Write a protein that binds this ligand. Structure first.
Ligand SMILES: O=C(O)[C@@H](CO)OP(=O)(O)O
Ligand SMILES: O=C(O)[C@@H](CO)OP(=O)(O)O
Ligand SMILES: [Mg+2]
Ligand SMILES: [Mg+2]
Lengths: 419, 424
């Protein structure tokens, strides 16, 4: 009944127009689970690896026909007859079939698609919504969203060294209210940024990327857009940053350097502005800097390891022991399977850290991360600006989940933060 | 078993981040149909009217709680127990329950939401895909897409006048190939534009909106992008345009970056000349909203070799369409599901144009969603053409993805419209 009958994959397009894999897993019950796999950066590196074609006569080598073939043949022959209700066993069967430590044989994209589609197929067989099937009876916490509003850096026309500037509606009584708050402030930002010498176009996440005079100015625009929309900073709306320092050395504020100096810069911002979170505040492998950044403001700021931890258990366990950070950014496709993602979410959580579930550049109509964040009571999500279906779909799923929980639903609010 | 047991609505967000209505229709079988309504007015008019809250303390008055209540209360009470498999009768029930000729009491958005969700609930009950449930056994034609790749006029800081420039992969053997062709060209145009000093922007469709100097420049940049991508203009790729001349119309039209005006007859001559210079197969709103005299003349001069699509001119209005059919005003109509307000009436407008030799072009709206109904509607009615924008934002791409799934599912039965979509 929950035993796999057929596993089918196809090549579809992501939110950038780039090819991506969609996997359909059909059970004996006749229930089908469908999943679209994201894609972003960077690699090859040492995150799980996606199987791309390299055929220059199709989509400039970005085709995923080999990953589709690894599902329709290799994964399908090996998993037909497997019980889809047994997620942990299915994922270790996928990892076993691949044999490589970074999913390079079958592809991280082929493995994750099956991994996620099998969970959805089974959830529909038990007639359960995904968050409930994944996290059990206690899955009820709606996350405070990290809503992108302003960009910066490479796209691009030139902006402050910084990369992403996000808002967080902590003070809201529900996700529905918090969503309205950020959407209002996103539109109110344009009633300040527009008619001043800028466009209304968007990027890959829906946010904007204008030109700025100083590094202190984007914060001043956001803080104005908050009270202009009628919201109180700190108490209701709080700032979350992703400077993504790995790509850069402030070029140019006049001060470029130094691992110890950089930590001192962030301490000033938090003292005058309501910053609750800082993501990739130091480089990919600058382990010495992270430890200092933690000891300085870790008890008043959230420090998120994105490129620093790359959704890896080995370096997450290393940063837990070293006390290098207090938050990890969870990218489903960076690890390659559901079980391994759930494993990394729990490890961070049970070490007093927070798991921030995130989307990527190449998104889809797929809303798994909205059900994964409620299933694990993660308390936070990073799924982009309130402006593109690749991002809005996730916010809509959170609205459906909140409504479906009824009186059981609880919005994380300030309780999402471990200060 | 296909009898409606529950009808519930909620306020979700569209691709612009504005509130929109989502309707769920649950049948006695336990099957649920879900539909999101795309947006959407509230360019009076002669169309169906959507219900917005006007409460400025929520989403700047753009809330949709009133339309949600008209569903959760008025429509649910009236339609619980109605057979969802009877589409026409259901839509007649929604139209009668409203009582207004423009769906202003309940809201066009509440009516469309239920009309669409009931069809999906029913398709799931018969265990059929939507296109099959809607158009029957002969629903198999995959459309040639009108892919938005360049933007101008309004969304133009100051350069350019017209509004949108699209490419159509007429020469492809399948929708899968045609979508790749357009994707490759759009990306090649992203290279061409950056290798000129501009950036890679994307208004709500996904198309690039640069500040250009001449009216020909967007068409030239497109010809270069088609060629550098490795495709042949005319034979493989054709240009479809929506200048939306209502936006630049005392008068006789006004071309800001060309320093001209002239007569509707001269504005026709402008299109006659441009069509001789570029592989333009289709032109949408070549003349303004109510220039019925101009439209009739534009048909006489180009209607034998160019598709003339009425959008703001016909506004998915069956009375205006019947007038234009007789008056010989156009030869194609842009079909907006939410401008008419119901599925039955959309099917009626598509059929009226189809019989009588016109083409029905199914279109998306500026504020779209994850909802992919128009992909199933274009196949169900074998329309042959779709207008779903650039191959970029998921609001657009979701529809392309649904068409890929439809083409795969049909297998040997699937047929891409190709050049047969046209009357050139
Ligand atoms: O940092 C992130 O969360 C994402 C942005 O969507 O980056 P990328 O997808 O490029 O890894
Ligand atoms: O015509 C269209 O395709 C869209 C995009 O501009 O406009 P509207 O909002 O009128 O649907
Ligand atoms: Mg990051
Ligand atoms: Mg138009």
């Amino acid at each position: 009944s929950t035993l796999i009958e057929a596993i089918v994959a196809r090549e579809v397009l992501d939110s950038r127009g780039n090819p991506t894999i969609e996997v359909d897993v059909r059970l004996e019950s006749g229930d089908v689970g469908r999943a679209i796999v994201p894609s972003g950066a960077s690699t090859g590196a040492h995150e799980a690896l996606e199987l791309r074609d390299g055929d220059k006569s199709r989509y400039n080598g970005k085709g995923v026909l080999k990953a589709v073939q690894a599902v329709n043949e290799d994964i399908a022959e090996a998993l037909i007859g497997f019980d889809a209700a047994d997620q942990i066993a299915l994922d270790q069967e996928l990892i076993a079939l691949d044999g490589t430590p970074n999913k390079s044989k079958l592809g991280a994209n082929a493995i994750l698609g099956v991994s996620l589609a099998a969970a959805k197929a089974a959830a529909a067989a038990f007639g359960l919504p995904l968050y409930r099937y994944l996290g059990g009876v206690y899955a009820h916490v709606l996350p405070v969203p990290m809503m992108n509003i302003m960009n910066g850096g490479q796209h691009a026309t030139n902006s402050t060294d910084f990369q992403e500037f996000m808002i967080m509606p902590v003070g809201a009584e529900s996700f529905r209210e918090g969503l309205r708050w950020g959407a209002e402030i996103y539109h109110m930002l344009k009633k300040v940024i527009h008619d001043r010498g800028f466009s209304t176009t968007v990027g890959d996440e829906g946010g904007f990327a204008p030109s700025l005079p100083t590094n202190d100015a984007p914060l001043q625009l956001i803080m104005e857009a908050i009270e202009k929309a009628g919201y109180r900073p700190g108490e209701q709306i709080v700032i979350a940053l992703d400077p993504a320092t790995t790509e850069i050395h402030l070029k140019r504020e006049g001060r470029s350097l130094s691992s110890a100096e950089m930590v001192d810069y962030w301490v000033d911002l938090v003292n005058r502005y309501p910053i609750i979170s800082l993501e990739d505040g130091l480089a990919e492998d600058d382990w010495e800097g992270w430890a200092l950044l933690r000891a300085k403001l870790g008890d008043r700021v959230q420090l998120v390891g994105d490129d620093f931890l790359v959704t890896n258990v080995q370096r997450l366990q290393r940063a837990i022991e070293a006390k290098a950070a207090n938050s990890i950014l969870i990218k489903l496709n960076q690890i390659g399977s559901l079980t391994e993602t759930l494993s990394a979410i729990q490890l961070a959580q049970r070490s007093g850290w927070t798991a921030v579930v995130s989307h990527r550049s190449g998104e889809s109509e797929d809303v798994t991360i909205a059900d994964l964040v409620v299933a694990t009571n993660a308390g936070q999500i990073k799924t982009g600006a309130p402006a593109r279906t690749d991002r809005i779909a996730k916010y809509n799923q959170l609205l459906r989940i909140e409504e479906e929980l009824g009186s059981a639903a609880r919005y994380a609010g300030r309780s999402a933060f471990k200060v």
